[PDB]
Amino acid sequence: MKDDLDNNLLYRYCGATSPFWRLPLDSNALQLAASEEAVTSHVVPLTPEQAAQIRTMSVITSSVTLSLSLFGELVPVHLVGRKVSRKEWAGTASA
């Protein structure tokens, strides 16, 4: 099992070890929020292919792992979630 004391670059970047994420149908900016009520706006600009990969998720929960560049370092980010509405995907992330 991963050691929970391993430095977590999501925590350093957006303020949560397991942030909530959202990806719309009209933008390739991945939103990372420390809470579902948070008002700030940490984003990761996904490439078109990365965003298309998230959008293969259906309305049933599944997982996709993306290699995101945080602080110039490639971090495997594990996105669990689903298509939550006609035009939005959302879930929780870990890293």
Author numbering: 1 to 95
What does the paper say about this structure?
DSFs are a family of fatty acid AIs produced and detected by a wide range of gram-negative bacteria, including important pathogens. The DSF receptor RpfR is conserved in numerous gram-negative bacteria, including, among others, Escherichia coli, B. cenocepacia, Cronobacter turicensis, Serratia marcescens, Yersinia enterocolitica, and Enterobacter cloacae. RpfR was predicted to contain three domains, namely Per-Arnt-Sim (PAS), diguanylate cyclase (DGC), and phosphodiesterase (PDE) domains. BDSF binding to RpfR was previously shown to trigger its PDE activity, decreasing the intracellular concentration of c-di-GMP and favoring biofilm dispersal.
We observed that the undescribed region of RpfR (residues 1–117) was highly conserved among all RpfR homologues. Indeed, we found that a construct containing the first 95 residues of RpfRCt (RpfRCt) was soluble and well folded, as determined by size exclusion chromatography. We determined the X-ray crystal structure of the RpfRCt(1–95) to a resolution of 1.2 Å using the single-wavelength anomalous dispersion (SAD) method. RpfRCt(1–95) adopts a Profilin-like fold consisting of an N-terminal α-helix and a central six-stranded antiparallel β-sheet with a single α-helix connecting β3 to β4. Distance-matrix alignment (DALI) and PDBeFold searches of the Protein Data Bank (PDB) show the closest RpfRCt(1–95) structural homologues to be PAS, Ca2+channels-chemotaxis receptors (Cache), and cyclic GMP-specific phosphodiesterase-adenylyl cyclase-FhlA (GAF) domains; however, canonical PAS domains contain five-stranded β-sheets, and Cache domains are periplasmic domain proteins that contain an additional N-terminal α-helix that extends through the membrane. Like RpfRCt(1–95), GAF domains contain six-stranded antiparallel β-sheets; however, unlike GAF domain proteins, RpfRCt(1–95) does not possess a pair of interacting α-helices below its β-sheet. Consistent with the fact that RpfRCt(1–95) is neither a PAS, Cache, or GAF domain, protein BLAST (BLASTP) searches using the RpfRCt(1–95) and RpfRBc(1–94) amino acid sequences return neither PAS, Cache, nor GAF domain proteins. Based on the above structural and sequence analysis, we conclude that while the RpfR N-terminal domain is structurally similar to PAS, Cache, and GAF domains, it is a new domain with a Profilin-like fold. As detailed below, this RpfR domain binds to and negatively regulates RpfF; thus, we refer to it as the RpfF interaction (FI) domain. Finally, superposing the structures of RpfRCt(FI) alone with the structure of RpfRCt(FI) in complex with RpfFBc reveals that RpfRCt(FI) undergoes minor conformational changes primarily at the RpfFBc binding surface.
